[PDB]
């Protein structure tokens, strides 16, 4: 390996090896079907709301979320990087795609597949990520950098359905090598959407952008159709041109058929024939290929940069609404405008990459965090895109000054922006992309008062309820399914309108998101103040004891959604607490003296009378009424940690936050597999995981990291990082279930899984507050 020094890998980069087999990998634990796509993936690439492709480490391009809020892995065997190699001398050269695996059947056939193991590393710190070959039977060594332009506080280049790959090539022998590296695209036009005639009318065409010291050559892989519809538009592969490389290309290669009319060409020479053919496909699928040949002297480098885009301008969902995408603010929405974003991204992507570098570097270089916090931090936020992220433009056919957001809770469990799970989840939205957590908030403040009194039947036991309560926060809003925005409180496994967490959430999300932004948005205040009280009064009306505190019912009535609490919870009893805090600030902020003084005085008595009934001495009990209420669970004072977050101060004695926190990491964590698989959810007091629900015998990847958090603010320094470092452990490491890239709510002590690819683990940048 004499190419890892022409580039720049971080050391944090998650790394496995081409072809790799993993041998430890988990699958789900769950009775009905559920999703497992395998450990064969890799970082994503592609903007928020654009769509997303999976390129995994073995090369190939799977995992598709261009349908927004599907997911669908399957490889698309035509979409490669291949490459040909000639020393100086030899009557023949080699071709070789860069694919560690082959077709299923014998579409393609000609083209020389299997790339070798032990020939080349993939290595990923989203959204950078990075393939080196260094292969006995190719002279010269060969990198690429693949990226999309996601940018914290930029809601345009990240917006982009786009991706860049940035190709290095070295020499380090003593003979000249002639080398050619093509990129094969499949027009894709038909893959979804499409219900009959799936390649009818789709065709190539090559544009060549020759302009002072540019060139740059693409092609556009369209249909005939001017159709505005979810499966119409664009894809173009393209390729900048640097001094000393020529270009060529093949317009038209059927995809459906051996692959010669294109390899035979790559494999004589690594040079194409430029054949343009615009002439339209019936039932045959096409492609285009497009590629470079360059002669490496002895020791000399040479960067060149591909690109691809895709402009599939409208969303979707299953309930009939269609949506134009965020990115069509910037290039357009009649779905002929790949080249013009391709184009963009070949002549921006070192400012791109200067900008990722500019972000990423404060925690880069911080020497006084280990490299695999770094590694788990950055790979977390593949999520934010692939998380069938849905964003905006204008419903098609309707303009407004907003542009709505819904980010999945995941793909098995398929709700929009799952408020009990964002809680958790949306820390990198505040954090990094703030305009768009505070519309998301917006969106729920404007839900509040919204009632819907048709009834809907409750999974858990089968009784009718009303859809949507007045005054209480939806569950969700929406499925991809159904009507995203529009159709709220789509999970029906309970019913959340009599949950007892999410109108204190609510109103934490709010504070939260005017503290992390630097407490100066009055407006965002003034925007939610009334839904917030709304929220807050409606939930002191489910205190059926006058203790101050809502009762939950004995049933699930919260996140932990088949665990039942009974009479006043520490979950939910902090997270009121400290709801009530957070809305007696909000009330001095805004000058509303009878909201403060009201909210005031709801927290000192329920403050009271939860430190009576829940504080047993070591650590705070479950609740007050269940079988096992005297069980250690992680989450017992997620109130405090937010409080901590909002700069609330204590909202329990720091002395027995500090006890409850010791107990958790001695019992939760180190009890549960010897700590080396997060903060197990529920715990005997006698060390035995309570097995009362499926739940408390899960550690949540959300709750493990949250909680590291928590510990983190408290000066449990060790405590933090040795509680995640189970969850990046089980998540990235040999020694782990091979879960990245789909990071899962929940494993039991098996290391298998429920519901991968999840919102909640994004709650890891809680702990860079
Ligand atoms: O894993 C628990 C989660 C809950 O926290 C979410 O509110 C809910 O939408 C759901 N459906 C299936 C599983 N879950
Ligand atoms: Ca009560």
Redesign the pocket.
């Known amino acids: 390996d004499k190419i890892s020094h022409k580039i720049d890998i971080p050391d944090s980069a998650w790394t496995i090896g081409i072809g790799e087999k993993f041998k430890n990998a988990g699958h789900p634990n769950v009775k009905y079907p559920m999703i497992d796509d395998s450990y064969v993936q890799g970082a994503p690439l592609g903007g928020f709301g654009a769509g997303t492709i999976g390129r995994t480490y073995n090369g190939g391009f799977s995992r598709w979320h261009l349908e927004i809020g599907k997911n669908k892995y399957t490889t698309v065997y035509a979409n490669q990087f291949s490459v040909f190699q000639k020393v100086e001398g030899n009557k023949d050269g080699v071709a070789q795609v860069l694919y560690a695996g082959e077709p299923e059947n014998g579409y393609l056939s000609s083209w020389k597949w299997d790339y070798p193991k032990e020939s080349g590393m993939y290595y990923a710190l989203y959204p950078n990520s990075w393939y080196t070959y260094t292969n006995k039977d190719l002279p010269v060594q060969l990198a690429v950098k693949q990226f999309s332009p996601i940018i914290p506080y930029n809601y345009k280049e990240t917006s982009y359905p786009v991706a860049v790959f940035k190709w290095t090539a070295y020499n380090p022998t003593n003979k000249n090598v002639d080398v050619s590296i093509m990129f094969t695209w499949q027009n894709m036009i038909g893959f979804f959407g499409k219900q009959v005639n799936v390649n009818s009318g789709n065709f190539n065409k090559i544009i060549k952008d020759k302009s002072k010291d540019s060139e740059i050559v693409a092609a556009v892989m369209g249909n005939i159709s001017n159709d505005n519809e979810e499966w119409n538009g664009e894809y173009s592969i393209g390729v900048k041109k640097v001094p000393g490389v020529d270009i060529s290309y093949k317009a038209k290669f059927v995809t459906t058929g051996d692959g010669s009319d294109l390899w035979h060409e790559f494999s004589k020479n690594g040079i194409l024939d430029n054949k343009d053919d615009e002439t339209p496909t019936k039932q045959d699928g096409i492609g285009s290929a497009i590629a470079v040949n360059f002669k490496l002297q002895p020791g000399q480098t040479i960067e060149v940069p591909f690109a691809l885009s895709w402009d599939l301008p409208i969303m979707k969902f299953g309930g009939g609404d269609k949506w134009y995408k965020m990115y069509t603010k910037y290039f357009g929405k009649n779905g002929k405008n790949s080249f013009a974003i391709l184009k963009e991204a070949l002549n921006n992507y070192q400012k791109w990459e200067k900008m990722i570098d500019d972000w990423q570097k404060p925690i880069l270089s911080n020497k006084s965090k280990p490299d695999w916090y770094k590694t788990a931090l950055f790979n977390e936020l593949y999520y934010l895109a692939d998380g069938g992220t849905a964003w905006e433009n204008g419903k098609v056919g309707e303009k407004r000054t907003n542009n709505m957001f819904g980010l999945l809770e995941c793909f098995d469990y398929n709700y929009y922006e799952t408020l009990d799970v964002r809680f958790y989840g949306s820390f990198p939205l505040v954090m990094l992309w703030p305009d768009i957590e505070k519309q998301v908030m917006r969106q729920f403040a404007d839900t509040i008062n919204v009632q819907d009194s048709s009834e809907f039947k409750v999974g858990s036991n089968g009784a009718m309820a009303v859809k949507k309560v007045q005054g209480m926060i939806p569950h969700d809003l929406g499925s991809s399914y159904a009507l995203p925005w529009i159709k709220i409180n789509a999970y029906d496994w309970q019913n959340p309108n009599i949950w007892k967490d999410l109108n204190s959430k609510y109103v934490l999300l709010v504070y939260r998101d005017y503290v992390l932004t630097g407490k100066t948005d009055k407006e965002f205040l003034k925007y939610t103040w009334k839904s917030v009280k709304t929220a807050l009064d409606k939930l002191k009306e489910?205190?059926?004891?006058?203790?101050?505190?809502?009762?939950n019912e004995g049933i699930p009535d919260q996140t932990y959604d088949t665990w039942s609490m009974k009479?006043?919870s520490a979950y939910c009893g902090s997270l009121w607490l400290a709801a009530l805090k957070a809305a007696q600030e909000i009330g001095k902020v805004l000058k509303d003296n009878e909201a403060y003084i009201k909210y005031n005085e709801w927290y000192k008595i329920a403050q009271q009378?939860f430190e009576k009934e829940l504080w047993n001495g070591e650590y705070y009990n479950f609740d007050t009424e269940s079988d096992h209420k005297d069980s250690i669970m992680a989450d017992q004072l997620a109130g405090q940690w937010y409080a901590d977050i909002l700069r609330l101060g204590d909202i329990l004695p720091k002395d027995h936050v500090q006890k409850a926190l010791k107990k958790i990491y001695e019992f939760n964590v180190m009890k549960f597999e010897n700590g080396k698989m997060g903060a197990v959810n529920g715990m005997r007091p006698d060390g035995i995981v309570d097995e009362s629900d499926i739940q408390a015998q899960e550690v949540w990847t959300g709750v493990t990291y949250a909680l590291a958090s928590f510990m983190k603010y408290r000066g449990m320094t060790e405590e933090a990082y040795n509680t995640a470092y189970g969850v990046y452990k089980m998540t990235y490491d040999k020694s782990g279930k091979g879960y990245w890239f789909r990071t899962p709510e929940a494993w039991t002590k098996d290391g298998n899984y429920r519901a991968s690819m999840y919102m909640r683990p994004l709650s890891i940048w809680s702990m860079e507050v």
């Open positions: 489910m205190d059926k004891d006058n203790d101050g505190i809502p009762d009479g006043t009378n």
